[PDB]
Amino acid sequence: SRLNRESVIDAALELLNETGIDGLTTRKLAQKLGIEQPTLYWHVKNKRALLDALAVEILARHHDYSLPAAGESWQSFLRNNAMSFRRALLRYRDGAKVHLGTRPDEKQYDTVETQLRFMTENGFSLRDGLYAISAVSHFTLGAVLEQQEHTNLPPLLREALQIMDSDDGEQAFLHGLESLIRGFEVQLTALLQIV
Amino acid sequence: SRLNRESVIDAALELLNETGIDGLTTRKLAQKLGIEQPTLYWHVKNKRALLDALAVEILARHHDYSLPAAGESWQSFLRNNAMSFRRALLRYRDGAKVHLGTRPDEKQYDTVETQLRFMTENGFSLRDGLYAISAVSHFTLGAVLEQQEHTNLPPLLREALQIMDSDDGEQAFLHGLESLIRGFEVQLTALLQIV
Numbered sequence: 001s002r003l004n005r006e007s008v009i010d011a012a013l014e015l016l017n018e019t020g021i022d023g024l025t026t027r028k029l030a031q032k033l034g035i036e037q038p039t040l041y042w043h044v045k046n047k048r049a050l051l052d053a054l055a056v057e058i059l060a061r062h063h064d065y066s067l068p069a070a071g072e073s074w075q076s077f078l079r080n081n082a083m084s085f086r087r088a089l090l091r092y093r094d095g096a097k098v099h100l101g102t103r104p105d106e107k108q109y110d111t112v113e114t115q116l117r118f119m120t121e122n123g124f125s126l127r128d129g130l131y132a133i134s135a136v137s138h139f140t141l142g143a144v145l146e147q148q149e150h151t152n153l154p155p156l157l158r159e160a161l162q163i164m165d166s167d168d169g170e171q172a173f174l175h176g177l178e179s180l181i182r183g184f185e186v187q188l189t190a191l192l193q194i195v
Numbered sequence: 196s197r198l199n200r201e202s203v204i205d206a207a208l209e210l211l212n213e214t215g216i217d218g219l220t221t222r223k224l225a226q227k228l229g230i231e232q233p234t235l236y237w238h239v240k241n242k243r244a245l246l247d248a249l250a251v252e253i254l255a256r257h258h259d260y261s262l263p264a265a266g267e268s269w270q271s272f273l274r275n276n277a278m279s280f281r282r283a284l285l286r287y288r289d290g291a292k293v294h295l296g297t298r299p300d301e302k303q304y305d306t307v308e309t310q311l312r313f314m315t316e317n318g319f320s321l322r323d324g325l326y327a328i329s330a331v332s333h334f335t336l337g338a339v340l341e342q343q344e345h346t347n348l349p350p351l352l353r354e355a356l357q358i359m360d361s362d363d364g365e366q367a368f369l370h371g372l373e374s375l376i377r378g379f380e381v382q383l384t385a386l387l388q389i390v
């Protein structure tokens with residue numbers, strides 16, 4: 001079938017849902033695309049290349065809150081950014097695993113640079129803005145991965161497991177996110193005060 | 196060689212460092228153990244079983260801050276618990292991936308029940324204590340996974356990438372951890388006040 005970049009990424013994302021990341025293979029991708037393996041090789045060299053592209057494309061297609069709105073607080077940007085990020089990672093099977101360990105792509109530079117600059121414009125040093133952003137990413141990644149991978153007792157554990165059996169992960173994520181954000185705020189506002 | 200539980204888990208952990216999680220196979224484990232595959236099968240049924248056991252054993256061997264010290268604050272317990280957890284996950288290649296999506300084992304019940312009970316004894320509802328604990332786990336998991344998987348530019352991104360190129364992940368983890376903990380504290384102390 002058609003083998004332009006968009007079509008290959010389309011088939012690859014469809015395949016990723018069928019197989020998950022560890023099961024996804026260029027052999028299976030070729031079969032999906034109605035092509036022989038050496039044809040596919042011309043377009044996509046190996047699994048790693050493909051995964052790196054899927055990481056970019058999942059966000060490009062689905063992660064829509066990548067920039068603060070006009071006049072938006074840094075707290076509110078991080079919140080919305082995290083929710084958007086989480087929902088994009090959840091859209092494909094093992095999407096958080098696809099994303100892990102990737103560095104911003106060239107096509108993401110202006111976005112990520114704006115995010116970093118925005119934090120500095122709200123009083124964070126670059127370093128502290130980065131650490132806030134990284135913590136949001138890491139928390140959201142851990143929560144998504146745990147959600148996507150979870151797919152006699154003592155009484156509090158029994159209860160806790162009932163609690164987790166009770167939603168998709170959203171409620172715990174949102175509560176934890178608020179805690180994170182408020183902690184950043186306590187840190188920012190402290191300036192050089194002991195806190 | 197010897198095929199008791201401890202010896203099999205020993206060889207499996209050694210193998211996990213050589214291969215990583217996706218590359219780890221029962222075929223390769225048998226070879227390591229000097230045995231044929233059907234011998235191994237008697238002891239270890241499949242990769243999943245093995246991984247579930249490695250998740251328990253990595254913590255049992257290396258995660259030493261599993262309980263609060265006498266008189267220890269809940270903030271200080273979470274801090275120490277997170278640092279211990281992080282260091283245990285980092286000890287083996289793909290250790291955080293091994294841990295993902297596991298539920299406490301029977302051999303972990305008393306530990307996890309104590310942790311949950313401790314949070315309730317410091318004023319958290321079970322639910323809110325659980326959410327605090329889960330957020331710590333998820334943040335630490337995301338940070339470890341990103342660290343373990345990371346193994347023209349606009350100027351702030353260039354700087355940020357220099358910043359991350361600069362340590363193992365520890366500094367950003369520790370800074371984010373403080374933020375998390377302080378946010379939980381702000382939430383706990385608020386009681387029913389709008390905050």
Ligand SMILES: Cc1c2c(c(O)c3c(O)cccc13)C(=O)[C@]1(O)C(=O)C(C(N)=O)=C(O)[C@@H](N(C)C)[C@@H]1C2
Pocket residue numbers: 059063065066081082085102103104108111112115116133134136137352355356359
């Ligand atoms: C600033 C930054 C970010 C990311 C990132 O990997 C990263 C890095 O690896 C080194 C230095 C800086 C960054 C993100 O992955 C990313 O997910 C992302 O690319 C991103 C994006 N492209 O919109 C985000 O929304 C951000 N977020 C979830 C907080 C975060 C931003």
Ligand SMILES: Cc1c2c(c(O)c3c(O)cccc13)C(=O)[C@]1(O)C(=O)C(C(N)=O)=C(O)[C@@H](N(C)C)[C@@H]1C2
Pocket residue numbers: 157160161164254258260261276277280297298299303306307310311328329331332
């Ligand atoms: C309370 C709890 C925990 C864990 C967990 O998976 C879990 C769950 O899956 C459902 C309900 C409750 C829990 C942990 O994995 C674990 O890593 C863990 O087993 C654990 C341990 N065994 O010592 C921890 O130290 C805890 N931590 C890193 C905050 C955390 C505790």
Ligand SMILES: [Cl-]
Pocket residue numbers: 001002003004
């Ligand atoms: Cl074509």
Ligand SMILES: [Cl-]
Pocket residue numbers: 004005006007
């Ligand atoms: Cl195209």
Ligand SMILES: [Cl-]
Pocket residue numbers: 071072073076
């Ligand atoms: Cl706002």
Ligand SMILES: [Cl-]
Pocket residue numbers: 185188189
């Ligand atoms: Cl502020």
Ligand SMILES: [Cl-]
Pocket residue numbers: 196197198199
């Ligand atoms: Cl034996």
Ligand SMILES: [Cl-]
Pocket residue numbers: 199200201202
């Ligand atoms: Cl044994």
Ligand SMILES: [Cl-]
Pocket residue numbers: 266267268271
């Ligand atoms: Cl203390």
Ligand SMILES: [Cl-]
Pocket residue numbers: 380383384
């Ligand atoms: Cl307190």
Ligand SMILES: [K+]
Pocket residue numbers: 099101102103104
């Ligand atoms: K990334």
Ligand SMILES: [K+]
Pocket residue numbers: 126351354
């Ligand atoms: K700067």
Ligand SMILES: [K+]
Pocket residue numbers: 294296297298299
């Ligand atoms: K677990």
Ligand SMILES: [K+]
Pocket residue numbers: 156159321
């Ligand atoms: K209870």
